[PDB]
């Protein structure tokens, strides 16, 4: 639901059973990757900071 691949209210996920629908799933999965990449950026960001703090 959070990544946009599911509706938080309707509770229906993306489907590929249509040629027209599949063209619109490429765009959604791109922004799905952006959120996952953004979250991993922060986890990596804290971990480097936590690494420095332990050394000090």
């Amino acid at each position: 639901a959070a990544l946009g691949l599911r509706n938080p209210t309707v509770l229906t996920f993306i489907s590929l059973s249509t040629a027209g629908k599949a063209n619109s799933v490429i765009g959604l999965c791109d922004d799905a990757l952006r959120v996952i990449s953004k979250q991993r950026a922060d986890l990596g960001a804290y971990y480097n900071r936590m690494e420095h703090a332990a050394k000090g």
């Binding site: 990449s37 953004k38 950026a41 922060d42 960001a45 480097n48 420095h52 703090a53 050394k55």
Partner: protein
């Protein structure tokens, strides 16, 4: 007094020793900013990519 004033100097250098110990990591992090600034100033990154650098 000579024996005492030496111990005051004995821990006098200890105070300076610990003060420099904290500044060691402070120097390390600003270098970590320095290397990332080199990567960020390129001409191939997008706003989504450059903001992940800003995250750290």
């Amino acid at each position: 007094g000579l024996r005492r004033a030496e111990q005051n100097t004995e821990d006098g250098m200890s105070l300076i020793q610990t003060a420099e110990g904290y500044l060691q990591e402070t120097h390390e992090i600003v270098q970590r900013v320095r290397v990332l600034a080199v990567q960020a100033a390129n001409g191939i990154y997008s706003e989504e990519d450059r903001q992940q650098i800003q995250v750290e």
